[PDB]
């Protein structure tokens, strides 16, 4: 229909940031509605390669405007720094960009508590991306924190900002032991960037709820993945948001009522960066072959994305969650060349009891041990296939299959990291 | 539909719980997807008056199971001092209530927090329930908090319970100079209902998902209103919680795209309990007519509700953010001998500006006035008609011009407390 969701069906990095760029082609509005610039979505046009963060996935596109709905939590600094970078490659971003005023923000102490709380998790530390979102969301619910809006008074501004910082302060060096963070430094930095912000601020709710009434096609950006949702996720390796489509309403001010489709990416196989469960983690030949065939690095230390088997148990409970109607499946052509691929059909519980529904808590999860299913890999090369009839038996097989255990259709089928790699057996917005 | 949600289109209050009582007549499931025991749902069927919190309203019917979300943050204090009065009137509850193990907790460290918080804002301090949702809310996104599902395990509920309250009575003592809660106490307190809780614990997603494959009628009851919603409403006076739509897919686990009937309860004036802007708010002899027949007085001090004309500039905002399909109007007969009535169709800027939508932030509220529409009373009791053909002609013309400018149908119309003192227009059950 007209509102289509894109949101990971696993731990984050399925391949959001390509289709959404993909699809948009026909979008007036692209939407970030949770998260910050924690998530990292590389998109390759035709060569040219560029990675996202904060701003949405619709950026390279004329004619479509990105909005960042009052979910996401935001970094000035972080939106600056991604602005010059594209407004240099000549992407005019100042004229396809618009901010929520009710964004929390993102301040340096947020990035230090962070860290704080992580290095004092010790051995238990979550593996976050250090960009302070947790805190973020926490000063928010908390209703301490600041907004965009607040920006609009400078003065007041500075009058809550000296409050917020006096208590996080208190927080770093008395119980954290840490260095403190300079009230003035921060104040002069925000303050710099108060009007590029300001600028670009627009009643998200008020327009997303008109452009339905004009029958516009909005395209709904997902960060992170349904595992890592502070509510269904695997708590507490999650994410500090919620990363389900209900957050799409909460995030952006559309009602419920009106998303028509929610793609779920699903990568061809299994990741995860930072601790957390993953029952299906391959320690062996095959785990370092999806690895260097994967090519999932990270940009820094700790950041290399671990890997596994599709878990399909797993896959299910993000279909029920988010009302799937569609999957995405991207990275096919990782698995090409092994020799026998195997998905994930039910879980072993230590009590010898084989359940096909993944447990809640971390700590749930502590003594799984999966349930395979084996089936024949392929030789021939599926990277870069455009056609379907291209695609060998056993890989189709392993579509199919797929269909079958979690009830849900793949739609589109990305077999290469281009814009133009790609099957769309059925559009979102045809649907 | 099967799933129709049942939430406060003001600033709570508006008749939530009678609402759900009656209704769930039909339902298989009742659902509470957000908030705490803040939340106050009175009751009176047949002259019997029940107040809840804590508990779904669908509680008092047979053959009607109700489930505590995930979205819920649970305090087992407030559960069972809950659950035993009603046992002691005869209703069963230990049968027909279910949990979810994501529910946070809610323990003594967190009303002390609240508390705290609240005597250090001081002059600009919210007017919270004092129940400790928001510290309970804070602890869950910080990734820190206890959940109903950490209780499995006693011994490690122990372990993790002594690094929060470690962390919590710092704060306490050395920040906001106060008693410190006690460790043991809480351990012991909590312990002693451990196997309470853990009993009545179910997989919401997995059944809500179920129940809606077998076509059963599900009723979420949603608590507080629209515009205390931590993001779209007045922040900071607001709850920490979605109230909105959205928080149903995110606090229950059911699917976007499976919410049906979105229906909205709607006072026939308004009301706010604590602080907050209220541009329509009356400080005059109907301010204290509207007081007085409302009989909004509150548990304690503080509690008393304020008071004013019904404002469709907030309730339009209300219709967007939901996605409404139907309104349910209460407490017509309030009203009854007014000479006329009013409702707030615009706001007039400050700066001269008639603006018909809503600010977000309180302190965008700071400087509007409203513009009322005003028209005739009625001297008729409408107390306890069941027949809209009994409804005064100045009272029908109400309803009619509450639907022009919303734009949404006024399907069932409450002329009383009572369960059985209410006109069923459309069912939403039926639609
Ligand atoms: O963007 C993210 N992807 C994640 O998997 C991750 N964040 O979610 C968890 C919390 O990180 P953060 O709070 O920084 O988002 C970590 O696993 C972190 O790596
Ligand atoms: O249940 C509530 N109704 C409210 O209006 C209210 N809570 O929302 C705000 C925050 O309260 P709390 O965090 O306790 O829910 C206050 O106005 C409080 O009165
Ligand atoms: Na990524
Ligand atoms: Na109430």
Chains 1, 2 share one sequence.
Not at 33 to 56: C, D, F, M, R, S
Not at 232 to 256: E, F, K, R
Request: some cysteine; glycine content about 10%.
């Amino acid at each position: 229909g007209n509102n289509v969701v894109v949101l990971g069906t696993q731990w984050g990095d399925e391949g959001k940031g390509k289709i959404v760029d993909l699809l948009t082609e026909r979008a007036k509005y692209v939407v970030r509605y949770q998260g910050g610039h924690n998530a990292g979505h590389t998109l390759v046009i035709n060569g040219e390669k560029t990675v996202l963060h904060l701003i949405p996935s619709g950026i390279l596109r004329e004619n479509v405007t990105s909005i960042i709905g009052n979910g996401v939590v935001l970094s000035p600094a972080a939106l600056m720094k991604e602005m010059k970078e594209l407004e240099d490659r000549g992407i005019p971003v100042r004229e396809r960009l618009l901010l929520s005023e009710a964004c929390p923000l993102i301040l340096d102490y947020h990035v230090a508590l962070d860290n704080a709380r992580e290095k004092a998790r010790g051995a238990k530390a979550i593996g976050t991306t250090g960009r302070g979102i947790g805190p973020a969301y926490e000063d928010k619910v908390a209703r301490r924190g600041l907004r965009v809006g607040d920006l609009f008074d400078k003065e007041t501004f500075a009058e809550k900002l000296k409050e917020v910082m006096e208590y996080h302060n208190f927080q770093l060096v008395n119980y954290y032991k840490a260095e403190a963070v300079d009230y003035q430094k921060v104040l002069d930095d925000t303050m710099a960037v108060a009007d590029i912000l300001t600028s670009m601020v627009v009643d998200v709710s008020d327009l997303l709820d008109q452009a339905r009434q004009r029958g516009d096609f909005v395209m709904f950006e997902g960060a992170q993945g349904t595992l890592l949702d502070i509510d269904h996720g695997t708590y507490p390796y999650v994410t500090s948001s919620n990363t389900t489509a209900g957050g799409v309403a909460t995030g952006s001010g559309l009602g419920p009522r009106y998303v028509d489709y929610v793609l779920g990416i699903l990568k061809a196989y299994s990741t995860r960066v930072g601790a957390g469960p993953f029952p299906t983690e391959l320690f062996d030949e095959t785990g370092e072959f999806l690895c260097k065939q994967g090519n999932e690095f990270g940009a820094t230390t700790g950041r290399r994305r671990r890997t596994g088997w599709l878990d399909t148990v797993a896959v299910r409970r993000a279909v029920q969650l988010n009302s799937l109607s569609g999957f995405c499946l991207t990275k096919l052509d990782v698995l090409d060349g092994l020799k026998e691929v195997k998905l994930c059909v039910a879980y072993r519980m230590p009590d010898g009891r084989e359940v096909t529904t993944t447990p809640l808590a971390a700590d749930d999860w502590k003594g799984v041990e999966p349930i395979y299913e084996t089936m024949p890999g392929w030789s021939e090369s599926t990277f870069g296939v455009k056609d379907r009839s291209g695609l060998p038996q056993a890989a189709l097989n392993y579509i199919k299959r797929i269909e079958e255990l979690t009830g849900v259709p793949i739609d589109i089928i990305s077999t290469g990291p281009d814009r133009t790699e790609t099957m769309i057996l059925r559009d979102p917005f045809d649907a």
